[PDB]
């Protein structure tokens, strides 16, 4: 595990950089697919995977990956920070500055992170005891990220999207 | 597009936070699968997709998504930044501080970003004239992110992993 202060900071910066490169490449892969460049999309998805490999390498070099219950706990703490501190403040500041699009994107994320924190707390209770959670499918709204387990609601309560738009993970 | 300075900054910070949560969750999904919790793995994967949605929303609200040629150009500049500036410095610093694990993860990423920059330059040439690239598959090394289009060397030139371990995008 890396211990020296400057190298640790540089790897955390590189982790952030690789995560953001991965994410832009996923966003760009979807746009290329929509514009009629399916091979360009394939290249973006593939390079996105390479940047996952690089960020995973940095993250393990920093000592941050543990067993499932501990990884769930990191999930819980991050989701809790975004629900209680980060997104309420960023949403209030956007409203204060009149930036309606940011009001919306921060509202969307906040309502979903409330769900994520609760799901990871239910998961951790099972993983603590060596059990897997019993969920069969998870549905995700592709507009706002709203997350539902086992059945999709009739429409998304956060953005109003129809049940038919939800993405299924089975 | 968001224009006020503080809101823009908070959206950039939220984009970084959602990217890193997505990346953590993909890393955690793989560890859950290895430890024998496939339903917790499925949960991490679906919630990572929700964070893709939230990041993509902030990224569009900042006005950073364009057409494929402009997105490739953002690719080129980021990859060129990592090759000529960021990784050489972080790698030399890790070496100076004796942090061999960081020397290795920065070396792995650096050699692959060299290839990414060149692939995106080749892709943009075609995109900016309305044509798709012609590629069949892309191979990615799961140890260091080495990337090869159409034909792969029999062993990864950076870490030595055999071609059978490469992840194939087709
Ligand atoms: Fe990378
Ligand atoms: Fe979340
Ligand atoms: Fe929604
Ligand atoms: Fe999120
Ligand atoms: Fe790269
Ligand atoms: Fe490799």
Automatic annotation (TrEMBL), chains A, B:
Keyword Zinc in annotation? yes
Q: Where does Zn(2+) 1 bind?
A: 18, 51, 54, 82, 113
- Which residues are Fe(3+) 2-binding? 18, 51, 82, 113
| Amino acids binding Fe(2+) 1 | 18, 51, 54, 113
Q: Which InterPro entries does this entry report, sorted A to Z?
A: Ferritin-like, Ferritin-like_diiron, Ferritin-like_SF, Rbr2/Nigerythrin, Rr_diiron-bd_dom, Rubredoxin-like_dom, RUBY_RBDX
Write down what this protein is called: Rubrerythrin
Q: Name one GO molecular function term.
A: oxidoreductase activity
Q: Which UniProt keywords apply?
A: Electron transport, Metal-binding, Transport, Zinc
Is Zinc included in the keywords of this UniProt record?
A: yes
């Amino acid at each position: 595990v890396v211990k020296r202060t400057m190298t640790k900071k540089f790897l955390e910066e590189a982790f952030a950089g690789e995560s953001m490169a991965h994410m832009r490449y996923l966003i760009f892969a979807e746009k290329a697919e929509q514009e009629g460049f399916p091979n360009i999309a394939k290249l973006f998805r593939a390079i996105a995977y390479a940047e996952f490999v690089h960020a995973k390498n940095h993250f393990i070099a920093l000592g941050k990956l543990g067993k499932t219950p501990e990884n769930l706990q990191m999930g819980i703490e991050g989701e809790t920070f975004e629900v209680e501190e980060m997104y309420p403040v960023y949403n209030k500041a956007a409203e204060f500055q009149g930036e309606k699009e940011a009001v919306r994107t921060t509202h969307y994320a906040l309502e979903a992170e409330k769900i994520h924190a609760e799901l990871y707390r239910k998961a951790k209770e099972k993983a603590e005891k060596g059990e897997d959670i019993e969920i069969k499918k998870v549905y995700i709204c592709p507009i706002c990220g709203y997350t539902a387990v086992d059945e999709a609601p009739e429409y998304c309560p956060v953005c109003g999207a129809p049940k038919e738009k939800f993405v299924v993970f089975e």
